[PDB]
TrEMBL record, chain B:
The keyword Oxidoreductase applies. GO terms for biological process: polysaccharide biosynthetic process. Residues 333-435 form the UDP-glucose/GDP-mannose dehydrogenase C-terminal domain. GO terms for molecular function: NAD binding; oxidoreductase activity, acting on the CH-CH group of donors, NAD or NADP as acceptor; oxidoreductase activity, acting on the CH-OH group of donors, NAD or NADP as acceptor. It comes from Micromonospora echinospora (Micromonospora purpurea). This is CalS8. The keyword Ubl conjugation does not apply. The gene is calS8. DTMP binds at K258, L267, G273, F339, K340. It comes from the Bacteria.
């Protein structure tokens, strides 16, 4: 009979008790941010390794501090759901070869939460799902234990909009999109994010609407990266620098803000950009809508790793080098800068295409695990940066990690084999920095640069 | 004598604008208004005689008045001859650059303009090309033509490209709010062009390393816009099958910072018109193709936006069928024929495709745009428009807002409900009415529908 049914008063002396189902990257970033603001958070993950550890810049140096305050704990069991105020589901939602969502992890998480759910609790789904999942799949699974959503517990979908590399800085200033499965669930979700995170909230009329926001965002990004890569390939045949063009074009106000030509790269990786547009495409296809912009964006960005390798080989040929006298040092293997995730990386495609022509390739990413490189590239990486760059006739920066921008190129020039080509895939070095490389005797070339 | 700069440092700045079209006149009046002496040179004796008398046939708001006043100050004059080029400080080329069926630029007007300017060029002058051209035109086509008279560009005279980024409808009100992109054919030409725009226009300048780079900026902008309207139109068709409002989605998505600014999902519509968006991407595609680069994003964006007029008509007919209406009891009042809101240009509009597709399934269609010329509608749609808003809406079983003019947002829908034939469908194509306004329509007895609304 309450006016605020699914959430206590934010000025309550007792801490807010939060349970995060799925202690992945999104899960841990949210856990540390919530715990840092005074909430008692339990991270629940099926992997015993992740759980034992808990018990991204700034993440490891914040999980440790909050685990010591006692506000951040972890469990393999869903038993702490019963004492919780808010349950946030961030478990994996991978797609199959046919771009259909694999509900196995979500279904398992919901089947475990459902009997432990208590009236008055708030449940937020955060996993990237196909539209209608919160209301037609998740809600009935959570209702098996006798409760009814919106009436007994609040159920809302809230898209994850974390930027890998600057996640902990961006998380606490960015507005949260909230799609409630009803007016009670929508009000509780907004009240939660505003008090627990200190962020603004953008309400949408339904959970479905909030599910579309996520897929529309990744479709927009992936398709704009495709415009940008083709623009780079076009600038390349004109002898024009694409970054000067993008910079000048983006000074024009248009739509809600500015003309926003995204930066080009070596291709697109991660879950978000290579799966979410295909998921929208399949969902649309099953409903009779053809998403041609997705089809084209995915084909354009999937051809970039092979194109990047062709540009490298062509630029090396122009220096009088080839697959017989050049060893390529690939610096950066992750898709996202300031991350070490190589699960789905366009670097894999570049390396494979260079090795397909007959080139000797060395790999070095300072943030990636060596076994992760072995499992993804089939070869062990270089022991250190010096082992990778020594005798290299090419330095291919296929990830723009902070550590690569902090390097001394004057020292590098003394280790590499001259003439050495520096290929700027995802560094996007400014004109002043490019002059430094040439001064040390380096040949500089980039995608549309 | 020292090596000269390509611009002076008491007497007013003398400017000659080759091509007194829309872009030409907007620039002429803006330059003259700030104290420059401008001569507009046009091949059409009609345009020249008008500007000389203070007349302007262009609808651009504030333009015919700006002409009127500046022609009276004597700072704005016009000529059919290129003879005033010799007394000029700065020569700005804004002549037409249409494309053919093959998306190849038709250089006839540009070549004629340059062949006339070349023998009149003197050392130390500044020449700016502003026409939307294929990359490399300033340096490989225009420069040799201007060098026939003995001079050498960058050494003897300044040559720079600077893209036109005028917004039709708010041109004069925005021509000074926007930084000018300057692509010089050298450091001397680049410095003179920046100095010119900063002093003559009072705007900031954005330098790019070459004329080619500045030529790409224009084509990249229109390619980005056209392709981002295609993403938006498909997103609307997708939201439609989900029963989700596309504007709530776009609004929420655009709250995320990304790239240089924000995630910028453009607004959906009934298609794409005008010279810029349907020709500039195809021009880049054709230039890339000749150089071995496939612009697939352009191919898809053009196909997606060309299918929108037919799709919009199909949605209208389907929504009318669901109401219990058909081509036999419904007359459709199409309100708005211009592709751009708060403009009356119907020369290349997706509204033509919608109307034609509705008339292809036997529907009676009335057209009413308050800003468009009636002869412009007759030439494009083959039929005369409605005499007034009341003639169009009277007995209409459908009100299809295919342009979002300010005039349409001001209408009394309580009053329209009494004029239309009930049940009446309001098709929202370009109005983008908020949820509160849609509720008000339902309360007058209107049926409301939009693609992805």
């Amino acid at each position: 009979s309450n006016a605020m049914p699914f959430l206590p008063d934010p000025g309550e002396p007792s801490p807010l008790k939060v349970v995060i189902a799925g202690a992945g990257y999104v899960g841990t970033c949210l856990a540390v941010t919530l715990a840092g603001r005074g909430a008692e958070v339990v991270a629940v993950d099926s992997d015993p390794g992740t759980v034992a550890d808990l018990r991204e810049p700034g993440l490891a140096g914040a999980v440790r501090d909050l685990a010591a305050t006692g506000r951040l704990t972890a469990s393999t069991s869903y038993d702490p759901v019963g004492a919780a105020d808010v349950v946030i589901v961030t478990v994996g939602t991978p797609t199959d070869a046919g771009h259909e969502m694999v509900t196995d992890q979500l279904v398992a998480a919901c089947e475990q939460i459902a009997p432990r759910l208590r009236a008055g609790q708030l449940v937020i789904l955060k996993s990237t799902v196909s539209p209608g999942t919160t209301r037609t799949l998740v809600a009935p699974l959570l209702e098996s234990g006798g409760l009814v959503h919106e009436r007994d517990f609040g159920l809302a979908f809230c898209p994850e909009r974390l930027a890998e590399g600057v996640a902990l800085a961006q998380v606490r200033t960015l507005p949260v999109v909230v799609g409630g499965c009803g007016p009670r669930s929508a009000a509780a979700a907004e009240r939660f994010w505003r008090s627990a995170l200190g962020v603004d909230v953008r309400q949408v009329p339904s959970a479905e609407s909030a599910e579309v926001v996520k897929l529309a965002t990744n479709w927009w990004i992936d398709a704009n990266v495709a415009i940008a890569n083709e623009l780079a390939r076009y600038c390349a045949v004109l002898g024009v620098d694409v970054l000067d063009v993008i910079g000048a074009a983006n000074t024009l106000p248009k739509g809600s803000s500015m003309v926003n030509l995204l930066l080009p790269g070596v291709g697109v990786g991660g879950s978000c950009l290579t799966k979410d547009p295909w998921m929208a495409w399949r969902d649309g296809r099953d409903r009779g809508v053809s998403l041609r912009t997705v089809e084209t964006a995915r084909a354009v960005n999937d051809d970039m790793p092979r194109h990047t390798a062709a540009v490298i080989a062509d630029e090396l040929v122009k220096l009088g080098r080839d697959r017989n006298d050049t060893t390529i040092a690939v610096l950066g293997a992750a898709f996202k800068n300031d991350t070490g995730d190589v699960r789905n990386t366009p670097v894999r495609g570049v390396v494979a295409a260079l090795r397909d022509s007959g080139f000797r390739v060395r790999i070095f990413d300072p943030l990636a695990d060596p076994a992760e490189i072995v499992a993804r590239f089939g070869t062990a990486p270089a022991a250190s940066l010096d082992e990778a760059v020594s005798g290299a006739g090419c330095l291919a920066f296929l990830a723009g990690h902070r550590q690569f921008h902090e390097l001394d190129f004057g020292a590098l020039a003394e280790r590499v084999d001259e003439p050495c080509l520096v290929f700027d895939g995802r560094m996007h070095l400014p004109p002043a920095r490019i002059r430094e490389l040439h001064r040390f005797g380096f040949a500089y070339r980039g995608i549309g640069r």
